[PDB]
Write a protein that binds this DNA or RNA. Structure first.
Length: 76
RNA sequence: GGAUUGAAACGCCAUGCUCAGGCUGGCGAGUGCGCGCCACUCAUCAAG
């Protein structure tokens, strides 16, 4: 894996000169080996329900989103 | 359409099993051992 996030660039400064921007993965300390102890052959059933937020409009109702989600899940 | 301690994340670059070394030197299948002792093709039937 990689050691650090890529830096935030300066767009205008980037092409004041013709130069590359990159992160070299295998350049010394940039390479970080990370192990993972992870699960196998999992299977879950999730029980959940909706709740309207302060951003909800008048036309927004929990039942409509519930049926939309059910349609999407049934159709894959 | 804001957030699944998430979002991004090569084990990777390369390295003759090689150089070589008789399975050889030599050793009779051999000495010997009757297929042999006997046994009618024979008793008949013109040529037309």
């Amino acid at each position: 894996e990689v050691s650090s996030k890529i830096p935030k660039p300066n767009p205008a400064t980037a092409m004041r000169d013709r130069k590359p921007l990159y992160f070299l993965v295998d350049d010394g300390s940039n390479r970080q080996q990370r192990a993972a102890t992870l699960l196998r052959n999992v299977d879950y059933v999730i029980e959940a329900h909706f709740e309207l937020t302060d951003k909800a409009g008048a036309e927004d109702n929990a039942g409509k989103h519930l049926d939309i989600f059910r349609r999407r899940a049934r159709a894959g």
